Design a protein around this ligand. Structure first.
Ligand SMILES: OC[C@H]1O[C@@H](c2c[nH]c(-c3ccc4ccccc4c3)n2)[C@H](O)[C@@H](O)[C@@H]1O
Ligand SMILES: OC[C@H]1O[C@@H](c2c[nH]c(-c3ccc4ccccc4c3)n2)[C@H](O)[C@@H](O)[C@@H]1O
Ligand SMILES: O=c1[nH]cnc2c1ncn2[C@@H]1O[C@H](COP(=O)(O)O)[C@@H](O)[C@H]1O
Ligand SMILES: O=c1[nH]cnc2c1ncn2[C@@H]1O[C@H](COP(=O)(O)O)[C@@H](O)[C@H]1O
Ligand SMILES: *Cc1c(COP(=O)(O)O)cnc(C)c1O
Ligand SMILES: *Cc1c(COP(=O)(O)O)cnc(C)c1O
Lengths: 809, 809
């Protein structure tokens, strides 16, 4: 059909059709007369997977012969989504498979919709891991993703009576054709036990053993014939485990529970034992694998051959585990082992929210990992000795910088352990990296200024342009060719088309087609009727007080009250769509979902409103729903309180896909606005500086309520039961929080938000100028490619050169 | 190499080699330089599985078009063993795969040794199920095996210090290439709840739902291109299950535990809830499948289209479940539903041991299956009304025949439920079926004499001759051709070779080769040195008091005491091998293993004995060890107390493979002796009649101890610590049982056993006459083919004609 989807050669199509029928027969043991769409999806998945195998074996072979420096990306989360379309895109197979499926009488797009998301992450951090794997493969880096093969990923979200219900994400029920079990590379992981001290040093004894079985998933680079590995560990019990008889076999599940379920909290630490077991399990199995590979290339060369990147503190135990292996098992002296550990490890910080920072109780580490606690205390003593020598007499600094926090319960500050044990610490957007140096890590910065870097986040333009928005990919490729897909900076060439009438028409046409296709998707799968000629106002991201879905709710209720006051006045029609999951135990996030649906129940059924205002809660927001709604969006809502959103990556997805942004100067929004120009961005609200000034004098919500009549009306509607007729007091927790305990200062940004939202409506009245501003955004989105991000990690942290040069086919 | 293994055509071998390299690359994602024997076994397994697929799809297709009567074999146990060699044998692929593997530089026999046994049974009953599936496929019957896909089969047996230790049989760790998951045919199974009575009859409500997911394994017939299905159910939780959040996901394991582990008791009932859940789970999922198939062919035709065979009482709930579906869901009247149920169901009884008969407490059925208890009580009332009408005033008969047993706890007698609900009840050897009519089922026989049949057990000559003993298969095929493999009665033609010198030499040569090959297997895998010129005295079967391993131990200690008394006299050298697992909770069986190893520790290290007497405990006796030792045996020990071994099938395996039998007139031993001639069999001991006569007057073990000096010496050796120097009283439980509480009358058969064992030694001194007696046994083993057994089930119970006619290829 379209050029960027590759060639449909006669030999290629014939060969794909024959392998599809071979897999249907031999692999699936189905004849054509009883095969379901699911059988057809699986036959296609096996057929495309076949094109990976040769490339995967050769790539791993090449890394054994060349022995380059190896990058190990340790994450507890990989938010992968679907693999089929991504594999076809990266192997240039998409048009050939479309053609081959069409000739067998099937619709490939309908087969793609059958694949389950690999939902092994919560949101931004897990999805950053997935974008990074794709960029590392595209840039020809000898990179490995290491994590946990959770049996249940992020829960499926159902809305029942406007409330979130959670269902188990049984993503493996029908099998995973993309993973290969490697039961032969199964490794032991130790828990509990005690430390004996001998003449020959410390010994960890009387441990419980859990086996880690690896599952390898291929990670294809963009048309470079490179296929890297994501290795995920599954927990298995040993066969002597608990070995009356029946109960001993049934109790094997205590051990296998380690890899059973992803913790579903975004930016919230829960100090549970099972979570600490998950953290050690991935770190222990992964470091044995790293060391095995290194010994098949003394430990002085380890950091020339190994980089370990820590995705937040979740795998921070990699630092004491590497010390334990180097000191206790390899018998290196402390100082040499520490040198190797620091040069090997690098720490990416993703948050400043205090309740998200990992602080493990000592009694927990004492029971589960006694030797790691000893090594952590030893790290702390030698670290505090360097602090004392550099800042003599500064006793408050010693208390603040300690890895051990004193109090009710002693805690380990895992962030402090990562800075001490890493040669590089980075934040994930320039303002976030500046805030790390000025606030939470100020003391560490003053000791070791050299460790602190910025690596601004990015997104892969493969999944987030070519895959989700082929029509936009194509009109761009019509003008400037295909090269931009692996060199996004080339999109700047689009600034010379900002006054080209045909290009303006094509950009608006693709947006309109994406909106029709998504409006129809809503009708088919969830029986809801939306005006496709309305402005698509989209806020999709996890439900969080800091992301201020509530600020958006206040705007929606304002528009509603303005329509009801002046029913017969023109307003730009909007479809306001909000989606995201709340953590199951996060009461306020569950109330916010319920408020969103309750506003919808009132606004969507008022005949005076008509099709001028619609409020839709998008159910089960996940990677595959993001691929559908983001290409359909006109307005991107990035409205976090200044200083709370470390980066965001949603923001980038929307910029790439032809939506204008309304946002605060938070996270990468600052850099997006700098790249596009402030005049091409709907910036409103407090800067970081303004929030600090408000904090010094005290945030009084009552002040905003007394001075803004439009705001007081909304709070009185909420209180009195305007939106909950049967349960008048349903939303009292929301009102009470907005009036007395709002950490994120929702009212402080209300006036400037509504005014700025009026400026959005005004520009939307002028299609041509709206589209010209969209072109200025797409044209300057190049910086926000994960290829740029990874090239910066490679050069400035890992010490390796990226390469766009192809392996042979 | 040998003819019965089929042709190695040039095109066939070339094609197998190419598919083996295709599977190594594409399926296993290995290059030849890192592949292990396990990778090579898997590549071969995938290559042979490919030859099944076409035949499997066509067979199932043929059954849909022809719509023949369908046979459903319901068993809680299928003791399958390894699949690779069996598949090759049945598809005539063995020589072609040997050749193809040889040319790729691999040894196929070494690859076969890598396959795990499917150990989803305890012993004879589970293995009878497996032999039956093979015969049903060979006789072209539209037959389905239905059971449970246990995650852990019968435990792996380790001997540590002469004691049995159990290890979890993790048979699925490396994957099962033979099964195909069918997650699309997943069915709900209900537990707990309560019964509401409405106007429209009884309703089972507020149940817990467990999902049953089927896994299909192919069952190939012998070169007839027929491939039947064994369908095994796995327990899965629904996704709303328990739906704080984390614990709800972890608690999914309560539901999935149903299919986790095979109960490891042979001939011992344990009334545990988890076991009752296993029984309902297979019956509920299976009857929904049977009914779905039937409705794609009113219920008057059900029994013309459906036979359900119950493998003992373990699936007895099939009877009330079919009533429940027919009465509660299909709305048939009681009498019509009952007619259909009786004509559909048939019950095979396998035991008379009281502690093996299933008697479920009512409080258990009341909680778990409330509606099935109501239906069982209703069955009992109408059954007892027919008993009362036939035997008016016979109130004791009413109490004895009741499905409900009164007492401390009310129990359901599941055997009584099966006779009432079945058109046919059979035992498994003629003497066993006679004992059913005279003792435990006398009352039922007098009511419905027509229901009671014999179907003498058999073994498949595919696994138990061609597969395990190719050299014997071949010398037979040299004289009489290959036809006997699917018509074992043809072995009678071997009686015309009983005086042929060349055939005598070939039979003795194959036995000698099998003994060398097994002696070498012992040395490699378990570092033990055996005289291959000795008589191989083998007792392999589950460890049980009724099977009298202890009688054998007394003989071994007698030979030892006779050697020590007269060291310089000639005795026929023996290797005495005993193997079998004890149920983990069966104290006395664990002591017997320990006694066997303790005798070995004394006998094997006495320099005066030399290589004249060896006692070996064969570790981890299972189907794959039976395939090795049974072809190596000279003497088969079948020494159960008369009336206790319902049939036995080991006995038959050994008769087929060229061992003479020493045994009691028990089980199929009676029929084996009748077929071969009493003069060609080492018969000793009490008949059933003699045991009864002893029971009437009282079994006094002291009488035998007072009169047999050789016996008194052994009991004094056992007591005093001759065999346990460090723990003098180790075996007091054994002595105490033999002297005061022996239900199986070990001493009563001692004298006649030793005398008969002297007759065995005497014939072994004359190789030619030993071999001539072996030929008379092999020659008359035809009756004991499972093809004969299944043809009898088909004609006399199921109402279908077997067929040896091939499906097209
Ligand atoms: O850099 C990628 C994105 O990372 C997000 C993040 C920070 N912390 C977490 C997180 C996730 C899971 C956690 C689980 C347990 C404990 C803390 C946990 C913190 N996620 C951050 O909010 C967003 O601005 C960035 O764009
Ligand atoms: O007909 C095949 C063979 O079946 C054997 C049998 C009888 N009962 C059981 C058994 C097995 C498992 C059980 C599990 C639970 C409760 C009772 C259980 C009874 N197994 C029988 O001893 C042998 O003579 C026959 O040759
Ligand atoms: O001893 C070896 N000989 C040849 N190739 C090897 C050897 N060890 C590893 N390789 C190759 O290196 C790849 C990577 O293995 P890994 O690094 O252990 O995951 C393997 O799949 C092989 O292709
Ligand atoms: O509706 C149908 N059309 C054609 N073939 C069918 C149909 N239903 C079942 N079959 C065939 O019958 C086989 C047995 O299916 P089962 O009896 O449901 O396990 C299937 O695998 C098909 O080959
Ligand atoms: C990109 C993405 C996110 C992160 O979005 P933010 O707006 O940065 O919070 C979360 N969830 C999914 C499914 C995503 O694709
Ligand atoms: C045949 C067989 C049995 C049954 O043997 P019996 O001597 O009849 O008890 C038990 N276990 C295995 C592994 C078998 O192959």
């Amino acid at each position: 059909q379209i050029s960027v989807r590759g060639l449909a050669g006669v030999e290629n199509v014939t060969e794909l059709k024959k392998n599809f029928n071979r897999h249907l027969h031999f692999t699936l043991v189905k004849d054509r007369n009883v095969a379901t769409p699911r059988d057809y999806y699986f036959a296609l998945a096996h057929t495309v997977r076949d094109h990976l195998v040769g490339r995967w074996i050769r790539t791993q072979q090449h890394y054994y012969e060349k022995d380059p420096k190896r990058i190990y990306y340790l994450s507890l989360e990989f938010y992968m989504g679907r693999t089929l379309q991504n594999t076809m895109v990266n192997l240039a197979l998409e048009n050939a498979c479309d053609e081959a499926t069409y000739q067998l009488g099937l619709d490939m797009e309908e087969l793609e919709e059958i694949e389950e998301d690999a939902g092994l992450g919560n949101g931004g951090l897990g999805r950053l891991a997935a974008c990074f794997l794709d960029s590392m493969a595209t840039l020809g880096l000898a990179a490995y993703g290491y994590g946990i093969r959770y049996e249940f990923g992020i829960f499926n979200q159902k809305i029942c009576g406007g409330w979130q219900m959670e269902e188990a994400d049984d993503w493996l029920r029908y099998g995973n054709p993309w993973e290969k079990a490697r039961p032969e590379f199964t490794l032991p992981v130790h828990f509990y036990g005690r430390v004996e001290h001998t003449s020959q040093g410390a010994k960890w004894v009387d441990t419980q053993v859990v086996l880690a079985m690896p599952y390898d998933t291929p990670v294809p680079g963009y048309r470079n014939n490179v296929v890297n590995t994501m290795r995920l560990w599954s927990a298995k019990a040993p066969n002597d485990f608990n070995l009356g008889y029946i109960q001993a076999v049934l109790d094997r599940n205590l051990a296998e529970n380690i890899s059973r379920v992803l913790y579903p909290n975004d930016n919230f630490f829960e100090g549970k034992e099972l979570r600490l077991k998950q953290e050690y399990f991935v770190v222990a199995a992964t470091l044995q694998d790293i060391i095995r590979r290194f010994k098949s290339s003394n430990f002085d060369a380890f950091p020339d051959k190994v980089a370990i990147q820590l995705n937040d503190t979740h795998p921070s135990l990699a630092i004491p585990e590497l010390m334990r292996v180097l000191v206790d098992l390899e018998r290196l002296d402390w100082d040499k082992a520490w040198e190797v550990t620091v040069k090997t490890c690098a720490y990416t910080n993703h948050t400043v929210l205090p309740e998200a920072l990992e602080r493990w109780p000592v009694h927990l580490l004492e029971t589960l990992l006694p030797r790691h606690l000893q090594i952590i205390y030893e790290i702390n003593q030698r670290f505090l000795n360097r602090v004392a020598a550099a800042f003599p007499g500064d006793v408050d600094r010693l208390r603040r910088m300690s890895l051990v926090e004193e109090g009710a319960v002693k805690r380990i500050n895992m962030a402090h352990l990562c800075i001490a044990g890493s040669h590089a610490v980075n934040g994930v957007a320039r303002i976030h990296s500046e805030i790390l140096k000025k606030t939470i890590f100020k003391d560490f910065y003053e000791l070791e200024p050299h460790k602190f870097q910025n690596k601004t986040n990015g997104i892969t333009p493969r999944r987030w342009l070519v895959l989700c928005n082929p029509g936009l990919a194509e009109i761009i490729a019509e003008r400037i060719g295909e090269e931009y897909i692996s060199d996004l900076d080339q999109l700047r060439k689009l600034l010379s088309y900002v006054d080209d009438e045909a290009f303006i028409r094509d950009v608006a046409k693709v947006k309109q087609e994406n909106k029709l296709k998504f409006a129809a998707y809503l009708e088919r799968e969830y029986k809801v009727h939306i005006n496709p000629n309305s402005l698509f106002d989209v806020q999709v991201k996890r439900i969080h007080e800091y992301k201020r879905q509530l600020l958006n709710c206040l705007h929606v209720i304002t528009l509603y009250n303005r329509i009801k006051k002046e029913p017969n006045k023109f307003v730009v029609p909007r479809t306001v769509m909000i989606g995201g999951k709340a953590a199951p135990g996060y009461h306020m996030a569950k109330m916010i979902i319920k408020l969103i649906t309750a506003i919808g129940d009132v606004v969507n059924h008022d005949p005076v409103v008509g099709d001028r205002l619609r409020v839709i809660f998008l159910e089960n927001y996940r990677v595959s729903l993001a691929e559908k709604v983001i290409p359909a969006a006109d307005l991107s809502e990035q409205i976090s309180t200044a200083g709370t959103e470390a980066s965001g990556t949603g923001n980038m997805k929307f910029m790439l896909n032809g939506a204008l942004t309304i946002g605060t100067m938070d996270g990468a929004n600052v850099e997006m606005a700098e790249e596009a120009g402030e005049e091409n961005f709907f910036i409103f609200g407090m800067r970081v500086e303004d929030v600090d000034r408000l904090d010094q004098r005290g945030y009084n919500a009552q002040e905003y309520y007394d001075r803004i009549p439009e705001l007081r009306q909304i709070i009185e509607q909420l209180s009195s039961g305007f939106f909950s007729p049967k349960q008048p007091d349903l939303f009292k927790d929301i009102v009470n929080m907005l009036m007395h305990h709002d950490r994120f200062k929702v009212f402080a940004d209300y006036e400037e938000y509504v005014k700025c939202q009026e400026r959005v409506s005004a520009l939307y009245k002028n299609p041509r100028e709206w589209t010209r501003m969209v072109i200025r955004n797409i044209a300057t989105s190049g910086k926000f490619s994960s290829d740029r991000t990874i090239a910066q990690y490679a050069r400035e942290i890992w010490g390796v050169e990226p390469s766009r040069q192809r392996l042979p086919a």
